[PDB]
């Protein structure tokens, strides 16, 4: 401490680093191999290609590009491999830390959610895509054993099937009310309304003001509409 | 999840339901009992529609079944990502619960079968109450005695005599030979309770447990759901084990008969005196505790309060702690005073929020902070916090 | 809680209430800051 | 960035030009002592190196034609929409004051409008109970109103039924009997209805009204 | 039979729906050439152009946008406030202001507990002064004065979709009415 | 990093401060090899296009230019500093040092709010500004 003070009198892994260090390594190498006359004008576009490749990996979009030199495409691929491995590994690494109660600070709490939801949605998509190939796993001999059980249960119970709600029905009003208010009560504690919530309040309100018209609309949706919005 | 029973009232009627049936407590000749807790695993996620449209056309006219079946495809979007839902169920739909419940009504019928399910429910003319029968003969006719399903989780109670039990366990041991006595490696004890109140590991009772879970494992196909020994808890009451252990909702209950109280016992706050409808005496004590799940949910919730607020008011922090703490005291009422670590976490978390206020006023922190600041009502200007 | 702290008075000795110059606290009311934060968010404002 | 291209310095010191404000043998022995010390005492580039060596054969024309940029995920459009949607918000209508809702008046108010359209085609449990001091304000006002008229039984009945909806039990039943002390039949019709609960006393009030 | 052709499934999935409608037409016209060609001599060279248009226009449908130049925050400098109050514009901002009754929720009476009513989730929703000092005792709440200007109303897109759905539901109920 | 220009002499710094009247001048003093210097370089590199109207961001190396080291007392791998009309600006961040900047800011919006608030308070000649965020858990 003393020596440092006197000289100054006479003079005066981890998720944060590793990613930026990958960008810097790859950009360093690519810029080194470029001819220096065209070098700087392309460089920003190359950075954009790295960003787009990462955004496409985060979307599961395959990122297939029109004509490109093969070695660069290989490089960006291997980069996506390493940065992906670190992104997922650190995403799962921080989550258990949040579970234990250790302090990861804050922005990590907020980002870890988005990362784990990208991962969760990927697991769901791979689940269903492998359910394309192999088809349903039930098989007829097992579906038989399952279906006889319900058939025998409902026949033994002497159960009459539920009919379709009639155009003229006693409790329609008393079913609309209980339905609509259960969509309504979400907004009763709010002083202010986001744009969508206000639209939904318009929907419930017209559903009260025009009950016959909404009964007809619901019933036709039941008999008819097979296609729905995402 | 019936309309008439609040889940703590459910746990109550479940314990009283276990006692009110005849002579499970006597071990005098060879008798024992077993509880299972098994989550059905992937259930709504493995729901398959080609089976649903049929099972629904059983219960409902086809136009509603077709609507319900096609309404689950849709397309699913999160920002960039999009996938059509072919396989699993979307439980964000208002009617999903119905399907889910109805779907469970299938699996309940593979375990119980027509014969025993008719004994549990009763005739359509005079169906039974939640826990009842008509004659004791119908109770004792089948090993399965009490059965419930709460959403995914299943509760199954068995009463065995050596005649019946020796058979079942000899079958499992026979078809899964274990010479090294490894049945007790993976068996899952309840970590909350001390030694004397846990499940003692003895070849007889463990072999019974794994035999039971091996039978019921076989009863359900693997296409519907996935039942695994890891998610399951098995309690055995016999000569060796005085304790009947289960966990319903967020509660953990142990049960002792007054008969076996000789093994070391210490009274708690959560003590439930249980009364047979005939002797009208107190034949059992059910001790209560809070689960390690919903204690850690409370940890993570007060953590969420002190984290997710970068900049908020002080009265919002006080009101979030008031809400979450009112919910925990309100649902868990008796079981809290019996939990040491939950009282400890309460004491830590409250002073911790007070520290978040203090660090919000000034960076130096005080020596002592008068409590009338925190604890006066909101109308007098304090935080109103409890 | 009010009586544990000594009553309203022992609480008001911990505040600026006597500075407000009011003789009695009966006819007084607070303007909530919750709603006060709402009326400011109907203007067009930057995140800062 | 014009000044970034130019690059003349002159002989000026930087601090003074802007008017800036501020808000050897022993060294050789220490160097030899550090030399006494140091004498006794990456992977990424190894991974991507064999590829950057394989960039060598890319001709200049292929470097010159690289498609400049592309937005695959449509991030811009979605960002503009998600921003357009979140801009403003709103204020919730006054009908959302939660205490008002009761189901009966809404149903009989509704099914009649339904049936009318078809023919044309052819207290809450949630509120906190009243606070003793508010109810005390009620007691003072109503006390002033009963002291206003000893006669005019309308007041007595009013202070009876309002405190009844508020509290009732002993208070109302005592007040009514107090101000019932004769001609007007209404204090009796009310006192009978509320205070009775048993036959004999019913008859006792009836006979007095008679 | 077309959706299984070569000119459709050789392209990414997102383009399929637009290629059918784009290819089907070019098929029809081709047939309408084949009816007019004399049997003795049958000739192409329309289908060459018509593959060119389809393949190229498909590459274009798959090409995705160019990148956009980052848009800037305008400037933090405050601007002098401008005022107008009409019959029209007060009617506009009626959406955007706290009404009278809504303002009375924001008043906490000094010294005594609020009226709070349980929300659907069970969390007490305070309305502080919104009910007259006498109305807490009786519990009659109030009607008071309801502002009809801040009532929720539909967006332009939703309002025609509702009405359309209802009008077609009407011809549906008629088709079931006579049958 | 490539997005932001670098200042290779003290006179590029000084003139960069002098020639710009209407928007803040934001300089990061630090070296390319440091860990904390590249992070604020990325953060500031994303923000530069949004803010180009009311502020501009530049880069300065300590080894390239050692002249300002003693005058502003530069320690720690990086210091961000804010200049308006040749006047060193100042804001109390809770870090106890109202001068310059030290720690790595987390979110873009929090740093844009710092720039916006320093700017707005700078137009009024106000020397000290108060950030909406006291981060002093960092320093």
Q: What secondary-structure arrangement, pairings included, does this model have?
A:
This is part of a larger assembly, with three copies of chain A, one copy of chain D (210 residues), one copy of chain E (179 residues) and one copy of chain F (139 residues).
Chain A: H1 2-10, H2 15-33, H3 39-58, H4 70-100, H5 107-133, H6 140-157, H7 172-184, H8 195-209, H9 211-223
Helix pairs in contact in A: 2-4, 3-4, 4-5, 7-8
Chain E: H1 6-9, H2 16-34, H3 46-61, H4 87-93, H5 100-104, E1 107-109, E2 115-118, E3 124-127, H6 133-138, H7 156-178
Antiparallel strand pairs in E: 2-3
Helix pairs in contact in E: 2-3
Chain F: E1 6-7, H1 10-18, E2 24-30, H2 35-51, E3 55-60, H3 69-72, E4 78-84, E5 87-88, E6 90-92, H4 108-123, E7 128-130
Helix pairs in contact in F: 2-4
Region (Important for branch point selection) (chain C): 40-48
Protein name (chain C): Pre-mRNA-splicing factor 8
Subcellular location (chain C): Nucleus
In summary, what is this structure?
Chain D has 210 residues and is mainly α.
Give structural notes.
The structure is cut from a larger assembly and holds 3 copies of chain A, 1 copy of chain D (210 residues), 1 copy of chain E (179 residues) and 1 copy of chain F (139 residues). Chain A is mainly alpha-helical. Chain A has helices at residues 2-10, 15-33, 39-58, 70-100, 107-133, 140-157, 172-184, 195-209, 211-223. Chain D is mostly helical and 210 residues long. In chain D, α9 runs antiparallel to α10 (170-179) and α10 packs antiparallel against α11. In chain E, α2 (16-34) runs antiparallel to α3 (46-61). The radius of gyration of chain E is 33 Å and the shape is elongated. Chain F is α/β, with parallel strands linked by helices. Chain F has one domain (1-139): Glutaredoxin. Helix content of chain F is 33%, strand content 22%. Chain F is built from 4 helices and 7 strands. The radius of gyration of chain F is 14 Å and the shape is globular. It is classed as splicing. Keywords: spliceosome, assembly, pre-B complex, U1 snRNP, splicing. Cryo-EM structure of the yeast pre-B complex at an average resolution of 3.4~4.6 angstrom (tri-snRNP and U2 snRNP Part).
């Amino acid at each position: 401490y003393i020596g440092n003070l006197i000289t100054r009198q006479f003079e005066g892994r981890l998720d944060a680093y590793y990613d930026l260090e990958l960008r810097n390594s790859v950009m360093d190498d690519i810029l080194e191999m470029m001819p220096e006359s065209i070098r700087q004008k392309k460089a920003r576009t190359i950075l954009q290609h790295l960003s787009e490749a990462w955004r496409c990996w985060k979307a599961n979009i395959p990122w297939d590009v029109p004509g490109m030199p093969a070695p660069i495409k290989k490089i960006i691929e291997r980069y996506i491999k390493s940065k992906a491995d670190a992104w997922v590994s650190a995403a799962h690494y921080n989550r258990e830390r949040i579970k234990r109660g250790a302090h990861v600070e804050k922005t990590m709490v907020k980002k870890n959610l988005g990362r784990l939801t990208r991962l969760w949605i990927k697991n769901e998509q791979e689940r269903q895509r492998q359910i394309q190939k192999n088809g349903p796993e039930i098989t007829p001999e097992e579906a038989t054993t399952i279906f006889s059980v319900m058939v025998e249960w409902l026949e033994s119970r002497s159960f009459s099937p539920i009919p379709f709600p009639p155009l003229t029905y006693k409790n329609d009003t008393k079913i609309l009310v209980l339905a609509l208010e259960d969509l309504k009560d979400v907004y009763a504690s709010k002083v202010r309304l986001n744009a969508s919530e206000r639209e939904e309040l318009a929907l419930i309100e017209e559903a009260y003001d025009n009950p016959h018209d909404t009964l007809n609309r619901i019933k036709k949706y039941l008999l008819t509409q097979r296609v729905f919005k995402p | 999840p019936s309309d008439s029973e609040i889940p703590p009232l459910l746990v109550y009627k479940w314990t009283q339901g276990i006692n009110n049936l005849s002579e499970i407590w006597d071990v005098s000749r060879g008798q024992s009992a077993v509880l299972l807790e098994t989550t059905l695993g992937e259930m709504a996620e493995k729901i398959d529609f080609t089976l649903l449209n049929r099972l629904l056309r059983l219960i409902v006219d086809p136009n509603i079944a077709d609507y319900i079946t096609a309404k689950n495809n849709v397309v699913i979007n999160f920002k960039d990502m999009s996938h059509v839902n072919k396989y699993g169920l979307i439980r964000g739909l208002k009617f999903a619960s119905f399907i889910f419940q109805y779907y469970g009504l299938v699996i309940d019928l593979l375990l119980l079968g027509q014969e025993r399910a008719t004994d549990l429910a009763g005739p359509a003319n005079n169906p039974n109450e939640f826990m009842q029968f008509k004659s004791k003969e119908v109770e004792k006719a089948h090993p399965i005695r009490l059965y419930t399903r709460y959403l995914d989780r299943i509760y199954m109670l068995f009463h065995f005599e050596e005649d019946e039990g020796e058979e079942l366990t000899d079958e499992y041991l026979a078809e899964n030979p274990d010479p090294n006595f490894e049945n007790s490696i993976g068996y899952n004890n309840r970590k909350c309770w001390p030694k004397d109140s846990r499940m003692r590991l003895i070849r007889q009772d463990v072999n019974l447990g794994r035999a039971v879970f091996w039978e019921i494992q076989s009863r359900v196909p693997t296409s519907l759901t996935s039942i695994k020994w890891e998610n399951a808890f098995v309690s055995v009451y016999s000569k060796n084990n005085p304790n009947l252990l289960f966990s319903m909702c967020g509660f953990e209950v142990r049960i002792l008969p007054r008969q076996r109280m000789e093994e070391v016992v210490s009274n708690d706050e959560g003590v439930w005196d249980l009364v047979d409808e005939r002797t009208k005496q107190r034949t059992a004590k059910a001790y209560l505790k809070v689960s390690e799940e919903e204690i850690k949910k409370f940890d993570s919730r007060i953590r969420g309060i002190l984290m997710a607020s970068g900049s908020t008011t002080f009265t919002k922090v006080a009101a979030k702690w008031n809400t979450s703490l009112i919910s925990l005291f309100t649902y868990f009422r008796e079981a809290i005073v019996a939990t040491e670590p939950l009282l400890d976490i309460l004491v830590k978390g409250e002073t911790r929020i007070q520290n978040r206020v203090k660090l919000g006023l000034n960076s130096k922190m005080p020596t002592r902070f008068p409590p009338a600041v925190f604890y006066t009502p909101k109308e007098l200007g304090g935080l109103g916090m409890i | 809680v009010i009586q544990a702290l000594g009553g309203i008075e022992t609480i008001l000795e911990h505040t600026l209430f006597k500075g407000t110059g009011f003789n009695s606290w009966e006819g007084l009311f607070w303007e909530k800051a919750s709603g006060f934060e709402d009326s400011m968010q109907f203007k067009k404002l930057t995140h800062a | 960035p014009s000044f970034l291209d130019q690059e003349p310095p002159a002989g000026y010191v930087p601090g003074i030009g802007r008017g800036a404000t501020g808000f050897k043998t022993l060294e050789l022995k220490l160097a030899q002592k550090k030399k006494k010390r140091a004498n006794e005492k990456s992977n990424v580039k190894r991974q991507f190196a064999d590829l950057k060596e394989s960039l060598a054969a890319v001709t200049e024309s292929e470097w010159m034609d690289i498609p400049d940029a592309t937005d695959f995920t449509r991030r811009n459009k979605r960002n503009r929409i998600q921003e357009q949607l979140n801009r403003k918000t709103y204020a919730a209508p006054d009908s959302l004051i939660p205490g008002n809702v009761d189901l009966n008046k809404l149903t009989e108010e509704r099914e009649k409008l339904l049936q009318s359209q078809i023919d044309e085609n052819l207290r809450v449990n949630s509120l906190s109970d009243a606070t003793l001091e508010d109810l005390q304000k009620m007691r003072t006002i109503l006390k002033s109103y009963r002291k206003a008229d000893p006669t005019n039984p309308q007041g007595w009945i009013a202070s009876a039924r309002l405190e009844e909806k508020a509290r009732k039990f002993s208070v109302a039943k005592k007040i009514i009997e107090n101000g019932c002390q004769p001609r007007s039949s209404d204090i009796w019709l009310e006192n009978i209805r509320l205070h009775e609960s048993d036959v004999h006393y019913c008859k006792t009030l009836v006979a007095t009204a008679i | 039979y077309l959706f299984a052709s070569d000119m459709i499934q050789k392209f990414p999935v997102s383009v399929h729906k637009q290629m059918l409608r784009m290819l089907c037409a070019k098929v029809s016209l081709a047939a309408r050439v084949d009816a007019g060609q004399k049997n003795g001599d049958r000739n192409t060279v329309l289908a060459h152009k018509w593959k060119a248009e389809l393949s190229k226009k498909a590459r274009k449908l798959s090409e995705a946008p160019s990148i956009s130049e980052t848009k800037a925050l305008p400037i933090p400098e405050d601007q002098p406030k401008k005022k107008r109050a009409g019959r029209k514009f007060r009617k506009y901002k009626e959406k955007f202001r706290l009404s009278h009754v809504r303002q009375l929720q924001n008043r906490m009476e000094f010294g005594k507990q609020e009226q709070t009513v349980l929300d659907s989730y069970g969390e007490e929703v305070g309305l502080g002064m919104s009910n007259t000092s006498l109305q807490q005792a009786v519990g009659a709440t109030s009607g008071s004065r309801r502002s009809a200007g801040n009532q929720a109303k539909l967006t332009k897109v939703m309002k025609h979709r509702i009405s359309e759905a209802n009008q077609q539901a009407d011809e549906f109920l008629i088709s079931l009415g006579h049958n | 990093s490539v997005l932001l220009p670098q200042l290779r002499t003290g006179w590029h710094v000084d003139q960069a401060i002098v020639t710009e009247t209407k928007r803040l001048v934001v300089i990061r003093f630090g070296r390319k090899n440091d860990r904390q210097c590249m992070i604020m370089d990325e953060l500031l590199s994303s923000i530069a296009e949004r803010v180009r109207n009311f502020a501009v961001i530049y880069l300065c190396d300590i080894d390239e230019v050692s002249d300002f080291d003693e005058m502003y007392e530069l320690t720690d791998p990086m210091t961000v500093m804010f200049f308006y009309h040749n006047k060193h600006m100042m804001c109390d961040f809770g870090t106890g040092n109202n001068n310059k900047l030290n720690f790595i800011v987390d979110d873009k919006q929090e740093m844009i709010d710092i720039l916006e608030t320093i700017f707005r308070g700078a137009r009024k000649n106000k020397g000290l500004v108060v950030s909406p965020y006291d981060y002093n858990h960092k320093r």
